[PDB]
Amino acid sequence: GRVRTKTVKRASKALIERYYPKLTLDFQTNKRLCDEIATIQSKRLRNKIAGYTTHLMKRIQKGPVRG
Amino acid sequence: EDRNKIHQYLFLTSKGYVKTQFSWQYYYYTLTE
Amino acid sequence: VQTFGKKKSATAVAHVKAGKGLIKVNGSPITLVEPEILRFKVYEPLLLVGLDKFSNIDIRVRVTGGGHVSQVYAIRQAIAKGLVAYHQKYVDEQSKNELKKAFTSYDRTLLIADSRRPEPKKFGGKGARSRFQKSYR
Amino acid sequence: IIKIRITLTSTKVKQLENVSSNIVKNAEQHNLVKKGPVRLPTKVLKISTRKTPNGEGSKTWETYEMRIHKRYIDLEAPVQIVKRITQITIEPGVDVEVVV
Amino acid sequence: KHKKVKLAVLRECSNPTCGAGVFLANHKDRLYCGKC
Amino acid sequence: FSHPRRYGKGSRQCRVCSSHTGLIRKYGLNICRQCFREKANDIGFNKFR
Amino acid sequence: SKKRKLVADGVFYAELNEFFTRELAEEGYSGVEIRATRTQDVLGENGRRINELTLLVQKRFKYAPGTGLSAVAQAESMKFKLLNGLAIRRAAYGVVRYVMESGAKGCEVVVSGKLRAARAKAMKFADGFLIHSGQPVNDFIDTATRHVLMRQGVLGIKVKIMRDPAKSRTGPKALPDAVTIIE
RNA sequence: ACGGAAGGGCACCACCAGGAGUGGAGCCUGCGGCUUAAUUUGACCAACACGGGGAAACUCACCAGGUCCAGACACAAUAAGGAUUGACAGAUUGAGAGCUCUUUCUUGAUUUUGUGGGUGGUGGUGCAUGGCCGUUCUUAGUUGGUGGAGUGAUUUGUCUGCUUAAUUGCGAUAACGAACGAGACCUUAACCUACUAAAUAGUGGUGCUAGCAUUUGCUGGUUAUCCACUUCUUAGAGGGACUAUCGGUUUCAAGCCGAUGGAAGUUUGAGGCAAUAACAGGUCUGUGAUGCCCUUAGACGUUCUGGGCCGCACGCGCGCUACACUGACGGAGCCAGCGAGUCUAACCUUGGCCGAGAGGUCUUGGUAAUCUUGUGAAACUCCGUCGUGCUGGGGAUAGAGCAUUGUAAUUAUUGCUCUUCAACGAGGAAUUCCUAGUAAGCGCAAGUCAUCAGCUUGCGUUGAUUACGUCCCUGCCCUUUGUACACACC
Ligand SMILES: [Mg+2]
Ligand SMILES: [Mg+2]
Ligand SMILES: [Mg+2]
Ligand SMILES: [Mg+2]
Ligand SMILES: [Mg+2]
Ligand SMILES: [Zn+2]
Ligand SMILES: [Zn+2]
C-alpha cells in the first residue's frame, strides 16, 4: 500500500509545527527547504517527508488537524 | 643424516622446541628459547 | 539528429539527416525489415501523420540487442523519435507537436520506450514466480 | 620521454576513485597531457551456493558477490615524474599496474 | 614379517659408489648385485 | 603405494577442510561449499541481492 | 590474471586472519591490517615473536626477504576467562558492562551449549540499544563467534557490539531513520 | 503451554475465473520394496534432480581380498662382535608386492619387541553439543520509562472499528512518550538529446574504394588511416517519484478508485538484511569444531586391485520427450543477455585442410569491455516435401561400425552413421505452479567436470488467458475461552 509510517508522519508534523511561515504547499519547493532544514540521510525518505508535509499543509487550508 | 637434513632445512614433534599451529593444513613449526 | 529506441533489450540508433527520402534499416530499405508480418509496424510513424509526407529527410537506423519483434519495435520507435527530434530542432516545434499528437494518439511505444524489463528469476523454480511442483506424500 | 598506461583495479570504489582523482590532479599540477580515465565495466562475480551445510530443509540458494572494478589512464612524462607518480598510489586495497 | 636372522660375526661391481662392501649373493648366475 | 589421482573429485580437496565433496572450483577458490559460506566475507565475497 | 589474482588475495587475507587468530589469541589478536589489543606480546623479546611470525608466514606463503570495542577481542577475552574458569553469567556480565561503558551504543552476548549437562539452553545477555536487519548491521555491528572447548562439550560464544553511530568518523554517522531538525 | 473449543483476519505454498500442466504413455533420476558379498548412508508441509550425491579408478563411508604405520614422546630392555632397514634371481599373488617363503646380501643407534602413554576414524550418539541452515515466518509480532488498575503475581499502553504488505496508519481511547521488528536501509532494473571520460565502446568526415548508379549519390572495407564528438555502450558524482495534479469515495482521516501527465503510480519491479523466541526439525557423512562411548597394528587409521552404489515380481515423487497440420522434414532469414576462459601450461578457442560425422590436424588471439564473442542460441519467420494414415508424428528397444575423454568405457560415459521402429488416438479418481515481461514455449551461460543433463543456479528471445475478489476448502496468525498442565499433552 501507500501508507506512510511514523518516521514519515511524525517528522512531517514536527516540520509543520515550526516551519509554517516556511515551505508552501508545493512539493518541489518543499523538498528543497527540507534539504536545508532537516538532516534526512536518504533522498527517498526526504521525498516521503516532503510529500507528506505537502499533503498536511494542503489539507491545513480545509480545517485544523489533530496533534 | 636423515634427521639432520630436516633439522637444518628448518634453520621430535613432542619433546619440545616445536610449537605447531595448523592454520589450514600447513603445520607451522616454531622452536622455543 | 540522432535518436535511439528500445523495446526489451534491443537498441535502434537512428540518424536523421537532410536528404531525399532515404530510409535505411540495416543497409536494406525499410521495405525489407523481414518480420513479414510486422512490416506494417515499421510504417506506423510514417503512415500515421501523412502517407508520403516526407521527401526531405533521411533516416539511417541500425538495431542490435534483442530479438526479431523487440528490434522491430525498436526501429519503429527510433524512426518516430528521429522524426520528432528533427522537426523539433530544424523545422519547428509547432509541427513537431502536431505530429507528436498523432504519435501519442496512436501510441504503441513509438515515442516512449516500454518499461517492461525481464523480472529476475528466483531459486526454487523455473521462471521468476512459477515454482517447482511440490508433492506432499 | 616515456609513454605509460596505468591500470587501477579494486573492490573498493571509494579508494579506487581516491586514486583515479589523485592521479589527475597530480598530473595537472605538472601540466601534462593524458587520455581521460576510462572505467571498464565492473565484473560482478556472482557465485551461488547452498545455505544448508547438509541436504535438509526448503531448497534455498544464496549467492555471493565480489564486484571487481578497474580503470585505465594513459599519459607521457619523464622517468622521475613516472616513478614519483607511481609511488603516490599505495592506497591499501587498490592495485596499480603501470605498463609502458 | 621381515626378520633378518641375527647374522653373526663375519666382491664388488660398477657404480663405484659401492665401497667394496656389496658382496654378491651366491645362489647361481646371480650377476645382479645386492643393491640392484 | 598410490595410483594416479591427478583428475576427478579425488585430485582436489578443500583448501581448509580437505573434504572432497561440494568443492568450489571457481575463480581459483578451491574451498568447500560450506567453508566458503563461513569464510566468504573475509575473501571479499558478500551478499547484496 | 586479475580476477583470479584478487580472489587469491582475498584467500590469502583469510589465511592470514585464521593463522593469527590461532597463533596470537593469548596475545589478544583482533585483525590483520595486523591490529591487536596489545602490541607488546607480539613484539616479544624486542622483535623475537614478530620476526618469527614473519619468518613462518613468509616461508608458508613463498615470499622473499622484503616482499576495547573489538568484538573478536571481547569474545576471545571472555573465552579465555571461561577456559581458566569463571561463572558463565559473571563473564558475560563483565564483558557486557565493559563494552557498554566503553562508548558502545549496545551489546549482546549469547552463550549456548552444555553449561552443566542439560538440554543446552541459550543464555543471552543484552544491554543497550541494538539494531537488526538492514545495511546498518554492516555499517555499525561487530560480531564474533567462538568455540570454547571445556571438558564436556563445546560452548558457542556470540558477541555483538554496536558502536555509537554519532562517533562514526567514517561512513554514515546517523541512522537511516534518524532525523534531527533545527529551529 | 496445550485443547479431537470457538470467533475474526490473511495467503495462487488457499479458493474463486482461467492458463500450464502432473497423475494416463516411453525413458531420465530420487525414494521405497526385493535381491545382492555389497546393492554404503542421512532425510519420510518443512524426505523422495535433497546431502550441492550428474558415483568407471579416486570420491567411498559398502563388499571380496592384499599392503603399510604416517604407534611420538619418561621408560624397561634388546644396541657399540650390530637393535632395525631394504632387496634383485625363483615359489607366491590380480600385481614389476620381498605380503610371505626358496635366500644371502645391504645398511646402521632412526627402529622392533612388552608396562606405560598417544594419533586417526565418512565408526556411534543431531535425544549430549557448537556453528549453520530449515520451519513457524510469502508472519507481524516483541518490549521499557512515567502515569492508571490490581494486596499481589501481573495488567493497560500493545484496542472496539476502518486502512495497509505490515502492531502500516487513522481513529477510538488511562494512557503519554518511545524502543526492537515492519518500514526506513542496501544491491540490482527501468530514465537523464543533463555533468564527467573513453581504437579496450561507439558515431560521422576527410584520404585510402572494390561494386552499383554515374550529377556524385546505396551498401560498403580501410584493426597504427586522417580529425571532431559522447546520442547508443560503459561508470563515477548527482538528478528524478513523493501515488504529482485533478475529480469520486472517503464516518472526521488513514487511505482507496478513476483520468491527466510522467520513463517509472501494485511497497515503482526483483531481491539482500530480517525482532523476542520454539522445535529434542536436519546436519557428528564439511571442518585439524567437539563431550562421551567404540575402534587403534588381522584397524572401523591410511593405501592398492576388483566389484557395488546403476542391480528388477512392484509402488511413489521431481522431470525429459510425445500423442501431431498452430506439426514433422528440408533449404532460406540470421535475432540476445547473464558469464567463463590458461604462466608453470594446457583453459576459451578464432582462421585453413581432411572426413559424412564425431573428430584429427597446422596455426592465431586471449591472464581479458581487447580473442572465442556479434557466443551467426533455440523457439521463431519465408518457400517447398509430407496429406492425414499408429503415417513421413514419437524415438523407446536392440544390431553393426568410427572417434573422443580417461591407466582403465564390459554393466553400452558421450558423440557420430545406417537399421527394427514399442506404448502413446490428449490422460480416471485425484493433484501442483502461477496475476505481466509474469504463466507457458524456447534455447544459452555457469555449477557439479578428464567425459557425460533429462539436474540446479542465472539469463535473455516470443509473450498470452483469466482475476483485481473471497473465506466454500487448506494452512497460518490474532483474540476469546477451558485446564487437575508449568519437565508445560511425549
Ligand atoms: Mg527492510
Ligand atoms: Mg549433482
Ligand atoms: Mg576410512
Ligand atoms: Mg500486554
Ligand atoms: Mg546413488
Ligand atoms: Zn650398488
Ligand atoms: Zn571447506
Give, in Å, how far the C1' of H232 lies from the CA of C66.
14
What is the distance in A from the centroid of ligand 5 to the CA of C137? 22
Please report whether residue D98 resides in a domain: no
Which residue from D50, D51, D64 is facing F45, i.e. has the nearest CB? Answer: D64
Whether residue C76 contacts residue C45, with contact meaning beta carbons closer than 8 Å, is answered with yes
G174: left (phi over 0), alpha (psi -120 to 50) or beta: beta
Burial B9-19, CB ≥16 within 10 A → b, else e = eeeeeeeeeee
**Could you tell me the CATH number of the domain that includes residue C71?**
3.30.230.10
Give the residue on C whose Cα is nearest the Cα of D50: C123
d(CA F6, CA F17): 19
Chain B from 1 to 33: CB within 8 A of any G CB: 21-24, 26, 28, 30, 33
> What distance in Å separates the CA atoms of residue G30 and residue G38, rounded to the nearest whole number?
9
What residue ranges define each of the domains in chain F, with the CATH number in brackets? 1-49 (4.10.830.10)
The CATH superfamily holding the domain G10-67 is K homology (KH) domain (3.30.300.20)
- Chain B residues whose CB is inside 8 A of the F16 CB are 24-25
Compute the distance between CA of residue B31 and CA of residue C14 in angstroms, rounded to an integer: 75
Identify the residue whose cell numbers are 534499416.
C25
Q: For residues B4, B5, B6 and B9, what is the CA-based torsion angle, rounded to 10 degrees?
A: 120
The reported resolution of this PDB entry, expressed in Å, is 2.0
Contacts of B10 in chain G (CB under 8 A): none
Domain residues of chain G, as ranges? 10-67, 71-167
Q: Which grid coordinates belong to A29?
A: 519547493
Bridge partners for C58 per DSSP: C17, C22
CATH number where D34 lies: 3.30.70.600
Number of structural domains found in chain D:
1
Residue C49 is part of which domain span? 1-123
Question: Could you tell me where the beta strands, DSSP code E, fall in chain F?
Answer: none
CATH superfamily name and code, G71-167? Ribosomal protein S3, C-terminal domain (3.30.1140.32)
Spatial CA neighbour of G95 closest among G107, G111, G112, G113: G107
G7/D45 Cβ within 8 A: yes
Interatomic CA distance for residues D20 and D27, integer angstroms: 11
D100 assigned to some structural domain: no
- Pairwise CA distance, residues G174 & C74, whole Å: 46
Report residues near ion ligand 6: CB below 5 Å. Answer: E 15, 18, 35
- CA gap B3, G155 in Å, rounded: 41
SS3 state at D95: strand
Q: How far is D45 from chain G (nearest CA, A)?
A: 9
Structural domain harbouring D59: 1-91
Which nucleotide's C1' sits nearest to the alpha carbon of C38? H381
Residues of F with CB under 8 A from a CB of D: 22, 24, 26-27, 33-34, 36-37, 40, 43-49
The percent helix, strand, coil of chain B (3-state, each to 5) is: 20, 20, 65
> Does D99 map to a domain?
no
Q: Classify residue A17 as exposed, middle or buried by CB count within 10 Å of its CB (0-12, 13-18, 19+).
A: exposed
Of residues G18, G23, G52, nearest to B24 (C-beta):
G18
Residues of chain C with C-beta less than 8 angstroms from the C-beta of D58: 124
Task: For residue G24, report the phi and psi dihedrals to the nearest 5 degrees.
Answer: -100, 20
DSSP state of C91: I
